Ligand binder design. Sequence first.
Ligand SMILES: NCC(=O)NCC(=O)NCC(=O)O
Ligand SMILES: NCC(=O)NCC(=O)NCC(=O)O
Lengths: 75, 63, 98, 91
Amino acid sequence: RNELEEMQRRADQLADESLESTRRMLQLVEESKDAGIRTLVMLDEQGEQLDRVEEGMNHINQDMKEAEKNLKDLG
Amino acid sequence: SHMARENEMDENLEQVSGIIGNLRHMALDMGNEIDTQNRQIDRIMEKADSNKTRIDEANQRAT
Amino acid sequence: KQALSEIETRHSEIIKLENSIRELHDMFMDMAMLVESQGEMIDRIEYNVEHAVDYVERAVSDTKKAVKYQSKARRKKIMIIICCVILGIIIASTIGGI
Amino acid sequence: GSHMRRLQQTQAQVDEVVDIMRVNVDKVLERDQKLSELDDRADALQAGASQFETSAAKLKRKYWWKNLKMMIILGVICAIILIIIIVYFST
Ligand SMILES: NCC(=O)NCC(=O)NCC(=O)O
Ligand SMILES: NCC(=O)NCC(=O)NCC(=O)O
């Protein structure tokens, strides 16, 4: 029964190869989750940075509106 | 053994499925967020265009 | 021969899954890469603005002072003239006395 | 047997998340342009603010100076009026 032996040897071969790519998948997906969270946290920190930058233009706008008032009192 | 080999590669393949469940969830927020940050920057550049016009004008009136 | 035909079918697709997962892995890896790369470009924007705000804030107070001093010097210019009107009156009050 | 729906399900999920991330990179790719354009106006503002900064400090010194001269001149002219008011009143 070598006919079936080499047909069931290359069948227990496909067995490990599949559980191995299942080990590998599990990892690639794990990293994708880490790398994903890092991205989400960054956007959260940079989200605040832009929040600050917007307060900036607001402040600047109110001030330039004042320095406007002033330079009018200077002809 | 190999009957457990399957039983294991199926048990953790199960995880793959679930974590991919998270990934989608996440990618949806990661998008809806950048959809707001690209909205912010578009606005900020408008306010910051008003202020360079506000300053270029005032800075040339001092002369 | 039957059990084999149904395994070569699973194995075949289980890899179609893996190769499609790596693709999703990079989508997530390159994501964190671009967001980290833009993160520093934001620090300069924030920097230059928090400076631009500082500058304008200083510049605005100065103007406020400039108008104050002007309004001071304006009052004095008047006092002075008043005094000179007084002197002209004095000078004319002598020449007006032979 | 369910070991084929599981693949038709999990693979369905993945395709979807990848279809999502294609879009998400297009949104990040724009955030790079929108963001790169703002880095320019941020620098092209701290500059004009540092310029108007100096132009404001100048007008301040100019009128503090202008003010100073007045007080001095007032000082002398008021001293004069004083001298006079004294000689024609000191017996
Ligand atoms: N009101 C006076 C003022 O705002 N600053 C006075 C000052 O610190 N001047 C610095 C200098 O004389 O160089
Ligand atoms: N011009 C006001 C004056 O009487 N002296 C000028 C002066 O001391 N300036 C300095 C300051 O205002 O602190």
